[PDB]
From a paper:
The attachment of myristate to the N-terminal glycine of certain proteins is largely a co-translational modification catalyzed by N-myristoyltransferase ([name]), and involved in protein membrane-localization. Using coenzyme A (CoA)-activated lipid, [name] transfers myristate to the substrate protein, after removal of the initiator methionine, in a predominantly co-translational process (Ritzefeld et al., 2017, Schlott et al., 2018). Pathogen [name] is a validated therapeutic target in numerous infectious diseases including malaria. PvNMT possesses 80% sequence identity and 93% similarity to PfNMT and is an excellent platform for structural studies, while to date PfNMT has proven intractable for X-ray crystallography.
[name]-1002 is a previously undisclosed member of our recently reported series of human [name] inhibitors (Mousnier et al., 2018), and a close analog of [name]-0917 that was discovered through a fragment reconstruction approach based on hits from screens against PvNMT and PfNMT. With parasite growth half maximal effective concentration (EC50) inhibitory activity of 34 nM, [name]-1002 is 4-fold more potent in killing parasites than the most potent previously reported PfNMT inhibitor DDD85646 (Wright et al., 2014). For PvNMT[WT] with bound [name]-1002, Y211 adopts rotamer Y211c, allowing the π-π stacking interaction with [name]-1002, which likely results in the increased potency and selectivity (over HsNMT) of this compound compared with DDD85646. Consistent with the high affinity of [name]-1002 for the PvNMT[WT] this protein was stabilized by >8.8°C with 5 μM of [name]-1002 even in the absence of MyrCoA. [name]-1002 and [name]-0917 exhibited interesting kinetics: both showed a slow dissociation rate with PvNMT[WT], suggesting that several hours may be required for complete dissociation. Data from the PfNMT[G386E]-resistant parasite line were used to guide biochemical and structural analysis of this variant in recombinant PvNMT, providing both enzymatic inhibition data and the crystal structures of the WT and G386E variant with bound MyrCoA and the [name] inhibitor (NMTi) used for mutation selection.
Numbering used by the authors: 26 to 410
């Protein structure tokens, strides 16, 4: 690969290798005064659009763009189908900027053909806490691919982030770009065995017959942590302490405020599920997972694979295996077909015993305008939606 765009940017070259004595920007002493005040030029016939995600119709336009044009797996079997309510949650976190929700319209039809977004948060990288933008939902319509629109969207959002005196960003992608700070494979725990076989997600063999696969993945409908219950507003302070204390061990994590804990964890049906174990007025264990369906392309029977994605999980009164067993059970009780997790935090340590299967790819973690040492994904303590 030539990386003709990415090598113009303050990111490491593909062979760059920094040791742990280095943890700092590529470019420092930046000045808001010097940031370009003009919008980046689009090709003739296209215009920038300020998306108001709190407006149902603008939000539905983003939803349609992503439903038809967003991420597919490597074999083009599935396409993510984030719900409109999910997009509202993901994009309106504390202190979010409407002007960081950037659309591109094709003038002649007035239809949205491109999108990119960022939200602000404090990111701790190798013990240094930096205000960053978290970039997500970059999407160009399938009919306009490989026309160099993506670098325009990236340059325009960079400009708008810089106008807020923010000079670093965090982002994830499946493609390999210069240059990952970490790389985490994803794994899958079957819940609805027959459906997964019928859609070609899982496989059988002469030893693993259908009935044997169903028995293998069967789960007992009893929690190891008996009092695990849906999180409520009263639990925000305790989750903030429990999760915040846990995350400090990692090389990369968000430093959540109490307002951010309330936003990212208080349950929303079909969006975000958080369960807590309260003992003596203290939150001692937590489970959380978000809902991200994938459209099953071409399937006449099933429109979607209903998947729960592991978010943040902490235990102090059980083993991590027992906690994640309860997470799988809670996903099953909420009608999910599969439970998906990355090999971040303590997750990989339970994948064999809890009967996860390895997926077919990995999610790379990246920083913009930051040079530092890379690390194994068990040292990652952040999950991007
Ligand atoms: C401070 C502040 C800084 C703020 C900015 C920080 C950097 C942020 C980078 C963006 C991060 C995005 C995180 C995501 O949200 S993840 C999900 C990605 N969503 C999809 O997977 C949906 C399906 N897919 C698509 O919609 C399109 O394929 C895309 C992804 C829009 C790409 O458009 P297409 O038409 O292919 O490509 P064109 O417009 O010719 O642009 C080619 C250049 O672009 C680079 N690129 C491609 N995919 C990228 C990607 N996902 N993230 C970043 N860069 C990407 C690529 O390498 C190349 O540049 P070079 O020539 O190699 O230097
Ligand atoms: C099922 C299924 N459906 N689809 C459509 C796929 C790709 C799968 C495979 C299963 O992927 C995963 C499983 C996990 F446990 C955790 C993460 C992913 C994942 C993979 C690639 C990803 C994304 C998320 C995102 C979205 N955020 C993070 C930017 N972008 N990219 C390019
Ligand atoms: Cl129970």
């Amino acid at each position: 690969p030539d990386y003709k765009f990415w090598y113009t940017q303050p990111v490491p070259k593909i062979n760059d290798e920094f040791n742990e004595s280095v943890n700092e920007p590529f470019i420092s002493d930046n000045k808001v005064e010097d940031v370009r005040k003009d919008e980046y030029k689009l090709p003739p016939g296209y215009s920038w659009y300020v998306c108001d995600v709190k407006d149902e119709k603008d939000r539905s336009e983003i939803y349609t763009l992503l439903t038809d044009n967003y991420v597919e797996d490597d074999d083009n079997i599935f396409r993510f189908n984030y719900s409109a309510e999910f997009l509202l949650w993901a994009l309106t976190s504390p202190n979010y900027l409407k002007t960081w929700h950037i659309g591109v319209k094709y003038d002649a039809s007035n239809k949205l053909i491109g999108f990119i977004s960022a939200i602000p948060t404090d990111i701790c990288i190798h013990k240094r806490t930096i205000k960053m933008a978290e970039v997500n939902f970059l999407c160009v319509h399938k009919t306009l691919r490989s026309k160099r629109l993506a670098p325009v969207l990236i340059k325009e959002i960079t400009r708008r982030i810089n106008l807020e005196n923010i000079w670093q960003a965090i982002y994830t992608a499946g493609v390999y770009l210069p240059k990952p700070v970490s790389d985490a494979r994803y794994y899958h725990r079957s819940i609805n065995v027959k459906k997964l076989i019928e859609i070609g997600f899982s496989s059988l063999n002469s030893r693993l017959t259908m009935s044997r696969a169903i028995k293998l993945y069967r789960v007992e409908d009893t929690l190891n942590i008996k009092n695990m219950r849906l999180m409520k507003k009263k639990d925000v302070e305790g989750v903030h302490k429990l999760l915040g204390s846990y995350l400090e061990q990692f090389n990369l994590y968000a430093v959540f405020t109490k307002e951010e804990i309330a936003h990212w964890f208080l349950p929303i049906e079909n969006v975000i599920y958080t369960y807590v174990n309260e003992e003596n007025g203290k939150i001692k264990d937590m489970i959380s997972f978000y809902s991200l369906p994938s459209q099953i392309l071409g399937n006449d029977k099933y429109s979607t694979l209903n998947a729960a994605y592991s978010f943040y999980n902490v235990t102090t009164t059980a083993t991590f295996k027992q906690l994640m067993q309860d997470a799988i059970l809670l996903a099953k009780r909420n009608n999910f077909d599969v439970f998906n997790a990355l090999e971040v935090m303590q997750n990989k340590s339970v994948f064999e015993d809890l009967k996860f299967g390895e997926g077919d790819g990995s999610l790379k973690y990246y920083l913009y305008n930051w040079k530092c040492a890379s690390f194994a994904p068990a040292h990652v303590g952040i999950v991007l939606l």
